[PDB]
Each structure stands twice: as structure tokens, then as C-alpha cells.
Amino acid sequence: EDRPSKAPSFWYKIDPYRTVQLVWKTLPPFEANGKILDYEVTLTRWKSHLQNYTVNATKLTVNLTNDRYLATLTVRNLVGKSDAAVLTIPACDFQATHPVMDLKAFPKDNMLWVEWTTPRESVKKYILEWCVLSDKAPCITDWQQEDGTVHRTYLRGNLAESKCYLITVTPVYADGPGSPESIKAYLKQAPPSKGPTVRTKKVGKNEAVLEWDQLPVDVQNGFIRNYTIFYRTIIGNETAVNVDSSHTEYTLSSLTSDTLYMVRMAAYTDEGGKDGPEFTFTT
Ligand SMILES: [Cl-]
Predict the structure, then answer these.
(1) What is the dihedral of CA 145, 149, 150, 151, to 10 degrees?
(2) Cα–Cα distance list, 43 to 54, 68, 133, 228 (Å)
(3) CA 203: distance to chain centroid?
(4) Which portions of this protein are annotated as coiled-coil regions?
(5) Which among 81, 72, 21 is positioned nearest to 50, based on CA atoms?
(6) How far is CA 54 from the centre of its chain?
(7) Rg of the chain (C-alpha set)
(8) Which residues, other chains included, contact 186 with Cβ-Cβ below 8 Å and sequence gap of 6+?
(9) Letter string b/e over residues 166-196, b meaning 16 or more CB atoms within 10 A of that residue's CB
(10) Are strands 18-24 and 59-64 parallel, antiparallel or unpaired?
(11) Ligand 1 center to residue 161 CA distance, Å?
């Protein structure tokens, strides 16, 4: 046989000394060239001694100083160890620059494609992170790695429908990271799983002020384009009104004094709408 053909994809996440969570990917069999026994990591605090760890996992958490660190990672099979994958963990006082330009993300062939403008400087590699935005879950990111030549690609892995992904592309140079650039996108959108709840702020005699709360990101199932307010009387006709997606209050005009009105709202995505709970009041 032979040792692993390739060095693993290699990246990190840091947040307060500071705690760094080194992470890597599992090399495919046709690159691992055999059963993977373990991985070897080393971290050299600038101008200090080399620290090392061997693990049979795909992550490593350590407490580092706010100094700089050079990281190395080698996956090991029976025949030997793969080439090392190098990282530079920038000193706390590091200033990143040179972001990507014209970042954009769009679904095509059931895959979520990301593309940007290839920068002037020469890039060593790209890092694409992405998590599902929710109000009942933190931003836990999946990720991948691309060569410095790439300027158009797709997120590798299992992506969900009706889920709003926050994608981040990060240039990587020998020096450290470039400035990140993010963007929100869906693999496939769909009618919201819930409609807005219309309630009366200020009830009047010849005019009513209605308010509602924006749909939590998880129930939208796609970018909300606009709302729609329906209302009628027990014996009247139903009137519909369009409302900008940014509005949280609307004022019904031309209302009859001492009357009962019935109201309900709808939320619309690029793929349809959803009604909310019916509501009633009286002038
Ligand atoms: Cl990868």
C-alpha cells in the first residue's frame, strides 16, 4: 500500500488566554489509502516550544495564549503519515483584510452554489462555513475547503429545504485569514409554516391600528416578500391589502363606528403564502 495521498482539510474556531477548537475532515478511502489509525497535531506558540497531541477524532480543543501559533496536522495509516496541513493562528492583535467581492449564493440542481470575484492577490485556500439561522438554535457551522484557484463552488454535504443558511466565505493567505464575507440563502424555499398573528394596537371609531410580530426565521421557510391583510364585516365584503415585508403596523381607514370587523393576515414567500389566526374587534 502507501501512506495517505493528501493532507486533511484543516481549520479552526476561536473565542474567549483564548480557547481554540481545531477541526478537520475525514479523508476519503481513496486518499487515506487504508484504515485511519489517528491524527497528529502540533502547536508552536510563537518563539516558544512545540506542543503535540495525537487523537483518533476530528476535533481538538485547547487553551492558547493571545500570541501567534503555527498548527500542523497529519493523518496516519499503517504505511505512514500524510503530509502536514498547516494553519496560522494569528496573534490576538491581528487585522484581517482583503475580503471576497460580489459574494452570492443560489440553488441549482438541488445544490446550493456559492460564487465570488477572484481577488487580485494570490490566495492559498478558501474556507466556506454555513449554519441554519434559527431562534431556537445557535449558529453551529458545517464547513469545507477549496483551493486558492476556486471562485465558484457548491456547499458539500446534506442541506435542508425550507431552511435559511448563513454562508461565510473566508480567504486564506500565508499570513492569516482575510476578512470574512457572509450571505443568507435557501436551498429550496416554501410557503411559511405559520401566518402572522394580527392584533389591535389602538382601536378607534372610524379607523383601526393593527400590529403584528415578524415571523421567527425558522417558520418563514424562505425570504418573506410581503404580508396581506384581509378584513370584512359579518355582512360585508372582504378587502385585501398589500403590506411591505418590513412593516409591523398598518392603519385601516374608512371604518364604520360601532361595528364588528374580522381580520386575518398572510405571509408570502417566493413559493406561496400562509394565513394566520382569525381576529375580531369592534369600533
Ligand atoms: Cl473539504
Answers:
(1) 130
(2) 12, 10, 33, 57
(3) 40
(4) none
(5) 72
(6) 31
(7) 27
(8) 107, 161, 162, 163, 164, 165, 221, 222, 223
(9) bbbbbbbbeebbbeebeeebbbebbbbebbb
(10) antiparallel
(11) 22
Residue 54 corresponds to which amino acid?
Answer: T
Q: Which residues surround ligand 1, an ion (CB under 5 A)?
A: 9, 25, 144-145
Domains annotated for the chain, with CATH where assigned, are 9-90 (2.60.40.10), 100-187 (2.60.40.10), 198-283 (2.60.40.10)
User: Which amino acid is residue 164, in one-letter code?
Assistant: C
CA of 212 to the centre of ligand 1 (A): 43
234 with 262: CB under 8 angstroms? yes
Q: Compute, in angstroms, the gap from residue 251 CA to the centroid of ligand 1.
A: 52
Q: Determination technique for this PDB entry?
A: X-ray
